[PDB]
Amino acid sequence: EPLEYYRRFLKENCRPDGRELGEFRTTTVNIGSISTADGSALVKLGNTTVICGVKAEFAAPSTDAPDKGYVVPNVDLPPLCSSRFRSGPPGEEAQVASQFIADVIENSQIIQKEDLCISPGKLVWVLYCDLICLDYDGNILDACTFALLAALKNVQLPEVTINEETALAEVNLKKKSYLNIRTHPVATSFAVFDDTLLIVDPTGEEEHLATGTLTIVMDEEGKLCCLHKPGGSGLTGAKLQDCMSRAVTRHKEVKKLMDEVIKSM
């Protein structure tokens, strides 16, 4: 009798865990936990958990845009996250999340691909940002985006040079250089029950028994990078402006958190 048990709390303006329908759960990060990787970031929202490792490599660009350093995300929902996933190739949710992360990276323009070209037409960086879920208690997109941004700030790259005599490039793993990122896109999630009831940061069950879901990415300068609205019972702008406000608030909060962290190092 799950749904009924849940409507009782919903109408008491609460949830069975102790959250007031509009607040998230304990959000925490950990930077630089990993040496083998250029950038590393652990994120966890109470029970939900995500980890991003960003490696850096060389590669030859395309012919349409030689001055473009690729940024390739891939999300991994291994079977140890939840039992709804099975050992094998990637399912559907992983792939959807991957395309979401890529759309974000491409639209928010947090990073200029041009800032990754060493020798146009010949070399350019490729940033393989690999995200891994470890507890899919719910709201995996927020965690994925936040971990991506955190690690992608942690990343400091080496410096390379070109020798015309050898016609090859050399690296200097001693000196390095951080990675400039302009926008700080944060993602805020929503679960829409029958008609008008929007809860924020929905956990697992709340997403299992929901009529629809929503996600909204809100850049710092009062703009949006993505309004992910896969199906749902419907919405009018009045049930949407409020979500945008709450998204701005969450942006503020998590950016303050991330600043405190990068400064506590």
Partner 1 sequence: GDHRRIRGPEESQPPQLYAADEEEAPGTRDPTRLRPVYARAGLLSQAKGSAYLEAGGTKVLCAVSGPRQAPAALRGRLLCDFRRAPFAGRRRRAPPGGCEERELALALQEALEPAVRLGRYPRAQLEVSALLLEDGGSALAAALTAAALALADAGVEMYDLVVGCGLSLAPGPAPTWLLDPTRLEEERAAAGLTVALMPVLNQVAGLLGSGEGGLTESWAEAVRLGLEGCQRLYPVLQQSLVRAARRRGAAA
Q: Which residues within the stretch 171-230 sit at the binding site for partner 1 (CB under 8 A)?
A: 171, 173, 204
Choose, by CB under 8 A, the member of 10, 72, 248, 262 that binds partner 1. 72
Binding window for partner 1 (CB under 8 A); candidates: 81-89, 177-185, 216-224, 249-257: 81-89
The reply to whether 37 sits near partner 1 by the rule CB under 8 A is: yes
Q: Which stretch binds partner 1 (CB under 8 A): 23-31, 74-82, 183-191, 240-248?
A: 74-82
Per CB under 8 A, does 170 bind partner 1?
yes
Residue 132 makes contact with partner 1 by CB under 8 A: yes
Q: Which stretch binds partner 1 (CB under 8 A): 13-21, 125-133, 218-226, 254-262?
A: 125-133
Select from 118, 98, 248, 115 the least CA-distant residue to 182: 115
CB within 8 Å of 165: residues ≥ 6 apart: none
> Of the candidates 167, 168, 238, 265, which one interacts with partner 1 according to CB under 8 A?
168
By CB under 8 A, residue 32 contacts partner 1: no
Residue 37: CB minimum distance to partner 1, A: 4
CB nearer to partner 1: pick between 26 and 87: 87
Q: Within a 13 Å sphere around the CA of 199, how many CA atoms are in the beta-carbon half?
A: 30
Q: Point out which span in 133-141, 190-198, 239-247, 255-263 binds partner 1 (CB under 8 A).
A: 133-141
Site residue total, partner 1 (CB under 8 A): 51
Stretch that binds partner 1, among 4-12, 14-22, 162-170, 176-184 (CB under 8 A): 162-170
Q: How far is the CB of 123 from partner 1 (least distance, A)?
A: 10
> Do the Cβ atoms of 109 and 56 come closer than 8 Å?
no
- Owner of token pair 């190739």: 89
The torsion angles phi and psi of 117, rounded to 5 degrees, stand at -85, 125
The residues that touch partner 1, with contacts defined as CB under 8 A, are 33-37, 40, 47, 49, 51, 53-60, 70, 72-74, 76, 78-83, 87, 89-90, 95, 98-99, 102, 126, 128, 130, 132, 134-137, 158, 160, 168-171, 173, 204
